[PDB]
Amino acid sequence: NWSVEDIVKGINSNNLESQLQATQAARKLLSREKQPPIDNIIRAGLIPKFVSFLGKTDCSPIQFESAWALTNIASGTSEQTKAVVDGGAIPAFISLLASPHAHISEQAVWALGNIAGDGSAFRDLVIKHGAIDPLLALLAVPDLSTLACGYLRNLTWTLSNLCRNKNPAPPLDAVEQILPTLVRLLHHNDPEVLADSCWAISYLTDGPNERIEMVVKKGVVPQLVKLLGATELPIVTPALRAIGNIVTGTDEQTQKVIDAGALAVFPSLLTNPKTNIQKEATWTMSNITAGRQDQIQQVVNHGLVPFLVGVLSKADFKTQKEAAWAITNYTSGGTVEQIVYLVHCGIIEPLMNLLSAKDTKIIQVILDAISNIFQAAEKLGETEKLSIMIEECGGLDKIEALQRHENESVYKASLNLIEKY
């Protein structure tokens, strides 16, 4: 490998081939794994030179080597990506998107993906410089399978970073302009094109209901549910995030997830061996039990209440807390027949056993749930049987000990419960 000093002596020559040799040497340094000397390359003042090499059309080799070098600089810290942008690289990379050499156009796609991935500001700056039009033009073919696999994966990933950050979210006109192509990629067969396309949809559905609706109006929910039952984990994870985001919106958007058959997949998702899949599936369930009664009923029909009892009985404490939320939402919006069915499935014992947890928020959520359950018992006139049950499993001892607690809202709800029943 060359020294930073030698790379500078060559790039500063007036010999295009001496400059090509040096730029290739710079690329090979930045493409090493151990501590790529990014900061040393920047102090040398080479970025403005690489940016200008992007424009030498009569020397394709120096365009590729400088694009590769700049791609890796822009992959580092926010300060290092800023240096690439401050050098004028953005309009230069957009121009390279139309290069007749595919490997150079691919490299420009990659570099712009790293720039837009920094955050909202650079993402919007890449969009203002007009990158979306030429990007989508690269995917305007009758069949995506005619495109090179790696070419297609870089395009999908870069598009994902143009739909990613928040505060603010990407411009509405940009999202509308990208979605038709994003939906085509969501039906492609490549696992990575699908995973990065599910991450993009995951980002666009993280926000207000106006953003959710725009995605759900393109009819991608059936396809998301299909991917939700995929064998590969990297596809199930973003597919579930998008599904979980969609159910934070209106009850009609939640209903489209139910109609696509999403609840049939949750027996597996709620017993998935991955802690993170189990937690996100439970979180999604908690937002579904917060919907209508006919929607709580559809949770019951699919046999998911026993699975919630199971997750509440044993799982990572964070998955357990999401299940506690799913029960409190279930009990607060459900009918009487639905709340007693919750007791027949055995919710009380694991719900009580979790009152020994060292977290104040879950205690409030559980106690509230118990209040909703007791309120439904008042309606059937069997408040007596339920209280014999909470006592036979040892729950009262916990409730009456919750009296002596630090927080005030716990003390009041706890006392109020032992006084009423």
Partner: peptide, 6 residues
């Protein structure tokens, strides 16, 4: 977020 080419 950001990826290098090695």
């Amino acid at each position: 977020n950001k990826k290098p080419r090695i």
